């Protein structure tokens, strides 16, 4: 009934050092700000307090030199995105709703995922070892499509062996986050203050996180309430008012890309006291954002996990 | 009849555009975030042959040593001429100033280098010199020192080519306010963007102060509206000078173009670069402009 597609993206995951940042200031501004400078159509960066993590196609990633500042992840990464019968985009922060069919699925059979949720869907993305067990995993459920050109098409075999799954600690800053999009036309008006968050910035405990997407032509933002006060007003859009987020962070060591079950673990207790988040890994931690009004009690529920 | 010392001590540096990438996080900040820097004092000019930056000290700071940049090795001071009570005097008034300034300062041995903006026209001279300056200058102008704000009162000269490329050239300035407006534009124009026309393109942001110059082909480029003239109709033409990098030693370069220019009553803007320098004259006169320079 559900349809999952498989998007023409080949994806590089990176982290770059804050020290180093600079150094990649030339091409991370191309693929920010100027579209007609690059053939890249998959562009993801998530600021932390440890790195810059940066998702890009092959396209975007022939544009980032080597350097010691410079972490490659060592897989490629195929994108999967679920829709409605037809192909009728879902609605956005419903990555519990896919706990179920989706992500328990994938962590039963050894599939490692990385989550990369938006303003305008949920993306997730898988090495392209395990595309066949993928498919195998998920076909009983979804009508499976491959997006060659611009269009649908119907739809090594050995998964390796991760490390024991285990319970992760986690933390919730008490930052209170924003979902934004934006009018592409008028991402040159906040260019230099985007800039200016992204390459010139840096006990109530809070987070340095700022993500900023441009994915198949559509921007979308993740900031705190307060770094929004930095934009010129009426340009960040958001088409449900008055809801802010809170981040519960995932991990204590850095959680590498080969154990499983993680965003499983997360997602499926908050499916179950039926909460909705978005859920954004990076390089080192994974990142789940919930309604702030339910904070609360969305620990107790991981905490009992 | 005033001469002012401004409160700038200026380096002059080029970067080979192989290595332009490199500097891209300072040069943003110093041409978009104020806020972020103290520098005071910024000029990028884009030639063909490289980008030329003559930033104060603190701008300097910001600026890693490479194997792309080059540095000149005097500390610059910077002379501006001005008013009966510091009232500014009308621009591209380099030639206004040929007699009283630049021909003593040639014949003395004072090298200089030569920056006109859209605002005024800016006359560096090497730390060492100062002394001659004042010596050459204190007959014909009261000399004042800029403090806090306040005004507290070589190798043989040698024969230069001259080039006059098609280019028409605009001089506008524009209310910072409105920076972020063109910011992409301008970043697309300086950082991503790279035969009877060249490549020319100056920006500079001094004491808040912003001057650019650009062909109009490029300011077409940007959004409309916001880019500010003056004295509209007739563009200019450029005359670039110089058969080979000039360096920074010879006298008597600037002299040799604006005294008979001055002679013959044209106005002129003058803007010095790393290798060569650039006369800008209206448009209409080029021709007589070029009679005028090869009476020689
Ligand atoms: N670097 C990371 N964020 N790793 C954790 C990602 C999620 C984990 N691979 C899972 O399958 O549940
Ligand atoms: N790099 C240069 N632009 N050199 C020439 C500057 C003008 C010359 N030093 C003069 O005093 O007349």
Same mark, same amino acid.
């Given at each position: 009934?559900?349809?999952?597609?498989?998007?023409?993206?080949?994806?590089?995951?990176?982290?770059?050092?804050?020290?180093?940042?600079?150094?990649?200031?030339?091409?991370?501004?191309?693929?920010?700000?100027?579209?007609?400078?690059?053939?890249?159509?998959?562009?993801?960066?998530?600021?932390?307090?440890?790195?810059?993590?940066?998702?890009?196609?092959?396209?975007?990633?022939?544009?980032?030199?080597?350097?010691?500042?410079?972490?490659?992840?060592?897989?490629?990464?195929?994108?999967?995105?679920?829709?409605?019968?037809?192909?009728?985009?879902?609605?956005?922060?419903?990555?519990?709703?896919?706990?179920?069919?989706?992500?328990?699925?994938?962590?039963?059979?050894?599939?490692?995922?990385?989550?990369?949720?938006?303003?305008?869907?949920?993306?997730?993305?898988?090495?392209?070892?395990?595309?066949?067990?993928?498919?195998?995993?998920?076909?009983?459920?979804?009508?499976?499509?491959?997006?060659?050109?611009?269009?649908?098409?119907?739809?090594?075999?050995?998964?390796?062996?991760? +490390? /024991?799954?285990?319970?992760?600690?986690?933390? #919730?800053?008490?930052?209170?986050?924003?979902?934004?999009?934006? %009018?592409? &036309? !008028?991402?040159?008006?906040?260019?230099?203050?985007?800039?200016?968050?992204?390459?010139?910035?840096?006990? +109530? /405990?809070?987070?340095?996180?700022?993500?900023? #997407?441009?994915?198949?032509?559509?921007?979308?933002?993740?900031? %705190?309430? &307060? !770094?929004?006060?930095?934009?010129?007003?009426?340009?960040?859009?958001?088409?449900?008012?008055?809801?802010?987020?809170?981040?519960?962070?995932?991990?204590?060591?850095?959680?590498?890309?080969?154990?499983?079950?993680?965003?499983?673990?997360?997602?499926?207790?908050?499916?179950?006291?039926?909460?909705?988040?978005?859920?954004?890994?990076?390089?080192?931690?994974?990142?789940?954002?919930?309604?702030?009004?339910?904070?609360?009690?969305?620990?107790?529920?991981?905490?009992?996990?």
């Amino acid at each position: 009934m559900m349809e999952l597609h498989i998007l023409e993206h080949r994806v590089r995951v990176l982290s770059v050092a804050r020290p180093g940042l600079w150094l990649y200031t030339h091409p991370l501004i191309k693929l920010l700000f100027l579209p007609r400078r690059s053939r890249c159509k998959f562009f993801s960066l998530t600021e932390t307090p440890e790195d810059y993590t940066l998702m890009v196609d092959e396209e975007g990633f022939k544009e980032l030199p080597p350097s010691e500042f410079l972490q490659v992840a060592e897989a490629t990464w195929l994108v999967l995105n679920v829709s409605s019968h037809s192909g009728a985009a879902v609605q956005a922060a419903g990555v519990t709703k896919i706990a179920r069919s989706v992500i328990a699925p994938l962590a039963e059979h050894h599939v490692s995922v990385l989550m990369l949720s938006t303003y305008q869907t949920d993306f997730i993305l898988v090495r392209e070892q395990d595309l066949s067990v993928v498919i195998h995993t998920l076909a009983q459920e979804f009508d499976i499509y491959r997006e060659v050109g611009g269009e649908p098409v119907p739809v090594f075999p050995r998964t390796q062996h991760g +490390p /024991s799954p285990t319970v992760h600690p986690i933390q #919730s800053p008490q930052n209170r986050f924003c979902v934004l999009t934006l %009018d592409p &036309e !008028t991402l040159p008006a906040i260019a230099t203050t985007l800039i200016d968050v992204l390459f010139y910035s840096h006990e +109530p /405990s809070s987070i340095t996180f700022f993500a900023f #997407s441009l994915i198949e032509g559509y921007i979308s933002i993740v900031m %705190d309430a &307060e !770094t929004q006060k930095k934009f010129p007003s009426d340009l960040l859009l958001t088409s449900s008012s008055g809801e802010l987020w809170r981040m519960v962070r995932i991990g204590g060591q850095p959680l590498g890309f080969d154990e499983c079950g993680i965003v499983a673990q997360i997602a499926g207790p908050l499916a179950a006291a039926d909460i909705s988040a978005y859920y954004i890994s990076t390089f080192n931690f994974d990142h789940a954002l919930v309604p702030e009004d339910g904070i609360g009690s969305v620990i107790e529920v991981l905490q009992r996990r």
